[PDB]
Amino acid sequence: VLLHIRDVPPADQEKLFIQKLRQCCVLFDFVSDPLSDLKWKEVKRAALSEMVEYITHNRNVITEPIYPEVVHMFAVNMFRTLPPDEPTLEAAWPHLQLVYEFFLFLESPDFQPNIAKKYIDQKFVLQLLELFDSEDPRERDFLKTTLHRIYGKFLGLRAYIRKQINNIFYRFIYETEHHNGIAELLEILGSIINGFALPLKEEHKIFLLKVLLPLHKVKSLSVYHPQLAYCVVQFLEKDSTLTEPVVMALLKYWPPKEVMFLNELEEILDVIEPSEFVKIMEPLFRQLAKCVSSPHFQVAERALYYWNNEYIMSLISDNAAKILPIMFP
């Protein structure tokens, strides 16, 4: 052997359960000799697979002692230093995917976060966040959800996380360092944003203006843009007041991928208060009248689909006076 001596749990006890997590800390080489310890690799694979089918299918098996055992295990496998266009994939996915799966334990009905709070602390949550720079998408996918759960269950870390994400975006926009998991992080925020309490704390108001808007200006914007748009329209929905510098910001940061802008805008228009619309109708339309002409074809068509919007066409009706002359006659 090379990881002790165990087997499926018919026996029923938890001590066995402990030992499996514990020999599942035995790490393997999937990189610098993929062909090593294939029999052992499969064992570890099966064990994780076992533990998963276990924790989902049979209640009151999560229990005070195992919390640190589970965390410790997730710790020992996931927290590692990462390698560096088309992506690199985690050679070790065959293990690491199940460690991802298994840890979602987070979602088991009898997860008591009160016991967990002991082990799923800031030191952890950090190195979790550190892993968002993974080139491998299907890993990021896992982290996105995982970290989501942790936020929604540990009120205790809600604070800390927010700061840490801030400090990523800030370093990303300003400190110029590329940070590689921005579309996932951004999808998180959308749901943190949706849930924001009223009135918007001026801090949130500021993060909009100092972090969320500058993202539009970056070169890779297309790569994370859908999710960026959501955060924006989620703001403009929580407080209808921020429309004024939001739309302006957008028109400044405007160009091709004109289309994405065209999406965000309609999605913005969909939520716009009439009194707030007037604030920007003039500059907005000058811009839009350009797009209907925009030689880039699919730009124009997209600009056209605005006129099919019943609300948008009401807003124009209400103001056809000032808007309509922004076409010819």
């Binding site: 998180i188 749901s191 949706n194 849930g195």
Partner: peptide
Amino acid sequence: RLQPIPE
């Protein structure tokens, strides 16, 4: 498909 969090 990600659930909103009562922040």
